[PDB]
Amino acid sequence: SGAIYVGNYRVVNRHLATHNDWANLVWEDSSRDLLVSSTTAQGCDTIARCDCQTGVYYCSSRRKHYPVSFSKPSLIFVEASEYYPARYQSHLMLAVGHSEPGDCGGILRCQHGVVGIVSTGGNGLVGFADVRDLLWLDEE
């Protein structure tokens, strides 16, 4: 589990969104595994605006932050799970790291700020849903 709290937005994995998220919806994209809902309180996370390919992510199944090298956001084949059928997920970045069921939502961050959230795992891989192109997270 986990979210990005930027301005009056909450950024979560679409597959983990709550009823309150759906009742306060700003934007959702199944192809990216992302959903954004509105918040009453202002958050403290800042979004990175960059093409960093190194950073650090939080792994809840280890209680550890790991430094990683990750691929540029791409259209990556993702295997069928309890949340989605076999499909191409867009804006996904891959790294080598521990990610098991429950690690989705952990933040990936670089020197500039938050890059994305854990969205895939297994096989000693971890995938991150990129948020750096969502410029609207910074206003309104």
Q: Which stretch binds Zn ion (CB under 5 A): 57-65, 67-75, 104-112, 117-125?
A: 104-112
Tokens representing 68 are 């990683």
Q: How far apart are CA 1 and CA 121, in angstroms?
A: 14
Residue 112 labelled as part of a binding site: yes
33 as an active site residue: the answer is yes
Identity of residue 123? N
Q: How far apart are CA 20 and CA 98, in angstroms?
A: 30
Tell me the residue number closest to ligand A1BQ7, measured at CB. Answer: 122
**How far from chain centre, in Å, is Cα 29?**
12
Q: How far apart are CA 128 and CA 116, in angstroms?
A: 6
Q: Considering CB distances under 5 to 8 angstroms, the limit depending on partner class, which of Zn ion, ligand A1BQ7, none binds residue 89?
A: ligand A1BQ7
101 touches ligand A1BQ7 by CB under 6 A: yes
27 touches ligand A1BQ7 by CB under 6 A: no
Kind and range of the H or E run holding 89? strand 87-96
Q: What is the dihedral of CA 126, 59, 104, 17, to 10 degrees?
A: -160
Between 35 and 54, how does the x/- string for binding to Zn ion read (CB under 5 A)? -------------x-x-x--
112 touches Zn ion by CB under 5 A: yes
Residue 44 labelled as part of a binding site: no
Give the catalytic positions in this structure.
15, 33, 104
- Chain residues in the site for Zn ion (CB under 5 A): 48, 50, 52, 110, 112
